[PDB]
Symmetry: D2
Subunit: 362 residues, 4 copies
């Protein structure tokens, strides 16, 4: 019997650990049982965002202190998914997943259950290709069993921190005779997010294996997962995977539902995600623990037949604008901008859309 608790903590800066320090000193959280931390940090969420690593370093230093272990050890034990980009009204915050297995009669029905798994370090020429998909698809199966979920349909969200291609990993693949998927480091964020997402779909039964190839990755937008949520960063060379869903063998005081935004202003999907997780009135909104969603600019350059400038705007990266938009739309349904939104939804929802999950109190 594993129980899961989730703490959404406001943060004053990327290195702010006080909110997690207040819940530990109070005993509401025992640090030894922390399995993952999902963060929105206030850099630009693109290539040169060092708030990701700053936030992970600051958290790792704090937990190594309170657990008496080394920073490197904490990194191997706890999944740090730091997603940069807090545009518009999006509030910086972290979500701390605690997994405490306690003996107790199991909640009839199904309750929140979380699994984590790491993949091996990829080679740069394996970034954004079938070997990233297959490897990620494997680790998702192992994280899914570590959560005590057997049916791939009890899964409602799969977060992933994935690597990207830097100038050194290009040369660290060129002098071995290997070409990389793309030359632009920014473009490799799309290829890393996308290949990782096709891994979720492959292991969850959403898309058959015959369809997936090198040429499909970031090209056949008909292929996509409905629960995958991948975020790239420079501070790593493997993929870290968090599987969230519902399990009969769970005692959590929480459930997780989801839906899929058809486009960036699909407030209907926000409300359906809310209803899939036991929130059906505007008064029950106070049971939200967090809302987690993908955003992206549609490749057509339109939303509902209306042109926008996201793909033409040379001043502001289109992932920055997508995040601002989708956060604002979710904020306006739940009346709270402190919700996880991440940009670049390659193979995560249809082109121009992305999955959205709500974790709510029962």
């Amino acid at each position: 019997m594993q129980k899961v608790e989730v703490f959404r903590i406001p943060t004053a800066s990327p290195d702010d650990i006080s909110g997690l320090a207040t819940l530990i000193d109070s005993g509401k959280i025992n640090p030894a049982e922390i399995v993952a931390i999902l963060g929105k940090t206030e850099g630009n969420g693109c290539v040169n965002d060092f708030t990701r690593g700053f936030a992970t370093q600051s958290l790792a230093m704090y937990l190594a202190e309170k657990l008496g272990i080394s920073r490197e050890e904490v990194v191997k034990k706890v999944a740090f998914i730091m997603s940069g980009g807090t545009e518009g009204v999006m509030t910086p915050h972290i979500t701390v997943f605690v997994r405490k297995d306690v003996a107790a009669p199991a909640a009839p029905g199904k309750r929140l259950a979380v699994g984590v798994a790491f993949t091996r370090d990829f080679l740069p020429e394996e970034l954004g290709r079938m070997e990233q998909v297959n490897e990620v698809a494997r680790a998702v199966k192992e994280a899914m069993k570590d959560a005590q979920i057997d049916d791939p349909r009890d899964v409602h969200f799969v977060q992933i921190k994935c690597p990207l291609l830097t100038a050194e990993r290009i040369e660290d693949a060129k002098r071995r005779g290997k070409d990389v998927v793309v030359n632009d480091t920014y473009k490799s964020m799309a290829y890393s997010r996308g290949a990782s997402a096709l891994g979720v779909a492959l292991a969850l039964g959403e898309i058959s294996a015959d369809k997936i190839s090198n040429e499909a990755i970031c090209h056949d937008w008909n292929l996509y997962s409905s629960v995958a949520s991948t975020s790239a960063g420079v501070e790593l060379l493997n993929d870290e995977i968090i599987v969230v869903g519902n399990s009969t063998n769970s005692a959590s005081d929480l459930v997780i539902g989801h839906s899929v935004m058809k486009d960036a202003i699909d407030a209907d999907a926000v409300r359906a995600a809310l209803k899939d997780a036991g929130i059906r009135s505007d008064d029950e909104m106070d049971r939200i623990v967090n809302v987690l969603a993908k955003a992206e600019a549609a490749s057509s350059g339109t939303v509902r037949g209306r042109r926008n400038t996201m793909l033409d705007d040379s001043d502001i990266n289109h992932t920055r604008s997508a995040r601002a938009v989708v956060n604002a739309v979710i904020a306006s349904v739940v009346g709270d901008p402190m919700v996880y939104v991440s940009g670049g939804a390659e193979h995560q929802g249809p082109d121009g859309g992305g999955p959205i999950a709500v974790i709510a109190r029962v």
Copy 2:
């Protein structure tokens, strides 16, 4: 002689695109001699160095001068051109064209859409953001109301103004004449100009008493504001251009206008209340929308409903750009259409962090 107002919301492909307007003129839907105002969203950055505003105005004036057989300057003396740059997020560039026909039909029963237009005099740089701007806008608002044949200020639902800003050259002109300007910063001057103009609206409509407004109150006392004023700064004029929109009992328009006030940037309730005030009482009637017109801003607390955001601390992206993307996305998500007018910088336009929102709808 009976005023009929027709409003056309026209998507644009670029700042200089006149093809949608020309299609309506070529089909006979719009007589170009009856155009009184054009309200634009142009795809520049909406801040200091936004030249899409002047580009779109020059393009529209050139085109209409050619259709009308008159000079560009004559067109600009006769037609309000209000271009608000900044189409961030999913916001769709477009123009809204106000046409005032004189028809041979009685006024429609009840009150219907009416529009009036008035220009102030040119302002010296040392008048921007001070009482001379406030009082001059107030007089011009009153003139536009009479233009519109609206007698009751409560029948005014949206006042759109283009206002000037301070450039380095204008500031230097004022210093050479011995005068100081309200602020020594072009970007900040947009706020004072927007703010003074909004207070002229409030003064003219009686939303605020005259003895509450003074130089020191401007862009400081946020308790003072208009609930219908929407003001936008640009480098391209030295005066204010005023469009008063409301409903008159002497109108044959097939349209009406309603409004509410957003209390903050994610106030979807205020969008629905403005829709209802314009007669749209359900999702299926949303197809009667002609346009939605809203003001957006970064609250001075640096928060929304107690949640911190980075708008006021973000040195890479100006906060008025963020406010526009946010409020446009919030409206897009209620009405299902991102091609709506949203303008940033809501000083004395609704509460701190909020702004007026109007809806023009078919009856």
Copy 3:
């Protein structure tokens, strides 16, 4: 016998025609003899820079009124090449080229000569490909003929305006079943700049045709022109060519010389360009009419072994940075930041460098 006069005119804004009208009203410029105007305008110099079209519309409208002809006839007759982006201390300005027929003695030696030619409009799928190369090369030859220059060694600068891709144009292409050269609007500027530059190298014999193919464009940086200077813009669908050199059939009181900057801080190359124009001492800098240069971020991410973030900065596009840098370097050598610097030097000088030309009074 042609005589060319060049006027460098500071501007207060993209639509500022007052400096030009003052020279027309004073009798210094016969507007009917203007053959080209080359501008630095204060937009961002990228995809969504509309100051370029604003400037061209304002100049075309002004000249059309002064000549009693239509705007369309002005643009068919005069080359308008507006290069956006006035970063750092670079000063917005236009350079106006006037060409007059004169009966004058055989000016000893060779003197400034200018030729103009336009290509047909391109379809979006032809940008960055051999169709563009080949059509630009044909236009370059016509421009040389227009300039009465027979020897390609007497050509010192070839300025081109060329189109780019927007989201809307890429969708038009797809809807016709065509694949564009790259799906990135920003990167489309580099393909269009690079293909135009190879068109110059092909026409001048700097590179033989059998070395140029679609796969070489924006990949083989060892193919380049030493005099090409190309600039992309949303405001036109063809290429406009200005060829600038010296010919024995010219009565100009000006000459043009050039060099190639090897990297973004190559002040040595600025001084060689000056010497090549006859400016043999610091006391003779007053004969400068204008300096014209290309700037770019090197693909290696480095300058003389030193790393910079130009290729990694998701907040500022690297062509903005490169323009700021090269303008600052030239400015510090000639004492004047009002010089023409354009960014993105694909196939224009070596990787990380670009041509630099000086127009000087003899």
Copy 4:
């Protein structure tokens, strides 16, 4: 008899300490003798730049484990001044100041000396006002004695890290009923830079006290220090001062010289600074250890009467542009873009100019 050594070390990211550690592992740096680290970090150098604190955290975390002590005591013992913003070709790097007492002979001539001092913490309502000026001026006199410099004319550079105002800090001052010096986060950096620079002028006797008042700060540009170089940051409440000059009680093999750039393209002042540091020809450039300069946009919006858009550009803040410009000018003179340039030179050199120092081997 003090001995100062200085090490300019390239960095690969804001948290890169491997260059420093290589010098420590090799025996060339005793980590216990480091008194100051001056860095350029690749954030945006403005308000929301977290690379400054990321770098400081990493270095403090590294030195502490090296010396066996806590972080709190490393930051109390070593001055960390991280200046963000590496635009243009400016290369990220840190400059490490090692100082140790020696029993050496009296070396004729004066030689590099370094002193350090910290001020008390400032309330938000004190930045940009006389409390900051006078407390900085007191700490400058203390750093001078720590450097064993008793003649202000032997001070060549005074580097300062100072605070700034965020929205949250401004809103807190309101709650407490206190008004701040300006209600703009970005503009608050200028006031804090400027009050600190005036602190240096007052301490060195460059400006007499009766000239300084709250009204003069960031208004009277005739008031300035010729050696002050100040840099604001979101990650501290006080000011840290490094005084760099020459002392007869020095056994350093280095010297420092300086000059004042009269504007952003004043290459003549770079060469004067080099010549004042004993570098008399181009063949002696190899003796440069580092160049340190302040850059800024002039309040007139011009350079030598030529307009630029640094103060007009709502997409790029003017300190970003100034740093790119001045770094490129210095790089073109010395052949190396890995030099320290900092933006915003309020009361540091004349309006539009700033001090520039050179540390060189004798």
